[PDB]
């Protein structure tokens, strides 16, 4: 029954120039602040409706009426991730097949089995910071990415990236980032000329080969191994579908490996980085979290059971995900003609985009203090209405890695708070870099050891 707001248009380009910025999600949040709970965004040949209120998003999350959509971003990265779990349609046969095969790799029982290898990498992080000299500082997102990449490599695939042995990032992730940048930049401007893009397109082939060589090696080293593994790669290679009784095909396996290597570390690094940012900006909250870590983590290394008792650290992480969910949007399509919210008619196939940071600032849900960092909002999880808090997506297409991410992040943040005091020595000004995920660029701290020993 109502007509939808729309931001500024530019002739035949429609709204597209508004995203000529390196911070498009933050630009869309500002449009949502100006225009409200829903607005229409048009580009040449596509329309998207952006949702920001829990009132409308709770309906969008009704899986009888809306299914996951492959947004323009997911259609773009499908060039690399193929029909892996993140980039396949719900009704593409390999989605449910791979979901069925890999679900058991993300249970609590699987988490108990990953714990010792998560501790392996977390101890390496703590030892790096213990070994810094006087007046040296920490590049926070850089070291969080070292940890999370190593953790998914070791836990998932028994592969050691050995990121803490490197002063620059592992070539695999440099090659991935550079291949994606090149693929993006290429979508514009006189492409077959003298240099083209890659110094005549050679660097992309090299970067593609880096990624294919690593996938080759992860698979070959497993098959040649005379040790028993039971990890994510075991299920990828050998798990049979409970429905059809067949394993994943070889091509899809390659896509799942690169999907999980990337999905399994990037957003978790961003979460750890934002959580430490908010802690040093809210020293009362840091103190409360540090007291919990000291009281709970009484052993030289944490046990799985002790990580489960880091209740306040978990609330800290959820509140960082509330303010800056590091995968900040997900996309849905209308299965049939329908009316959203009693007021906005949709046609079959219409795209809805959930603007998660704005959902998480809905004052009718959280109160007027939405910009404050207050972990106590999560003291009682049953008090949060359904579909108010969605940093991991929705329904059967929600993040399969959610518990892995939160166990890793709770473990590591707990050990950080046990072993160091933290100083915001530069009075860092939050600068949020946007790729397909969010991170606090240039965030640096100093860590003063509490001199607490690590069986590390
Ligand atoms: C705090 C960290 C993380 C956040 C915020 C996050 C966020 C998300 C979101 C929002 C989705 C839904 C995407 C969509 O609807 O298009 C998703 C799906 C997915 N995530 Fe994550 N994720 C995190 C960590 C992880 C980890 C650690 C892994 C792997 C170990 C992972 C693997 C996946 C996969 C495979 C899917 C697709 C699930 C499916 O459709 O079957 N994510 N994640
Ligand atoms: C969105 C993000 C993600 N999704 C879900 N859980 C964690 C994440 F970290 C991402 O890593 C983004 N990304 C894309 N190319 C580089 N990075 C991603 C990973 C794999 C993928 F198949 C698609 C995809 F969008």
Numbering used by the authors: 2 to 457
Article sentences:
Surprisingly, voriconazole coordinates the heme iron through a pyrimidine nitrogen from its 5-fluoropyrimidine ring. All other voriconazole-bound P450 crystal structures on the PDB show coordination of the P450 heme iron through a triazole nitrogen, and thus this is a unique binding mode for voriconazole. A novel DM heme iron ligation occurs for voriconazole, through a pyrimidine nitrogen on the voriconazole 5-fluoropyrimidine ring. One of the few direct polar interactions observed between the protein and one of the azole ligands is made between the triazole moiety of voriconazole and Glu267. In the case of voriconazole, it was clear the 2 R,3R-stereoisomer was bound, while for tioconazole the R-tioconazole was identified as the bound stereoisomer. Similarly, small mother liquor-derived compounds are present in the case of tioconazole (a molecule of 1,2-ethanediol) and voriconazole (a molecule of glycerol). The voriconazole, clotrimazole and tioconazole structures contain multiple monomers in the asymmetric unit, and in each case the general protein conformation corresponds to the “open”, substrate-free conformation of the enzyme, with little significant difference in protein or ligand conformation between monomers. For all the azole-bound structures reported in this study, the hetero-aromatic nitrogen ligand is oriented so as to fit within the groove of the I-helix formed between Ala264 and Glu267/Thr268.
Among the bacterial P450s, one of the best characterized enzymes is the Bacillus megaterium CYP102A1 (P450 BM3), which Armand Fulco’s group identified as a fatty acid hydroxylase that could catalyze the hydroxylation of saturated fatty acid substrates, primarily at the ω-1, ω-2, and ω-3 positions. P450 BM3 (BM3) is a natural fusion of a cytochrome P450 (N-terminal) to a FAD-, FMN- and NADP(H)-binding cytochrome P450 reductase (CPR). More recent work in our group has used the double mutant (DM) form of the flavocytochrome P450 BM3 enzyme (F87V/A82F), in which the first mutation expands available substrate binding space in the active site, while the second mutation is more distant from the heme but causes a structural readjustment in the P450 that alters its conformational state. We also report the first structures of the BM3 DM heme domain in complex with four different azole drugs, confirming the greater plasticity of this variant and its ability to structurally adapt to bind to several azole drug compounds.
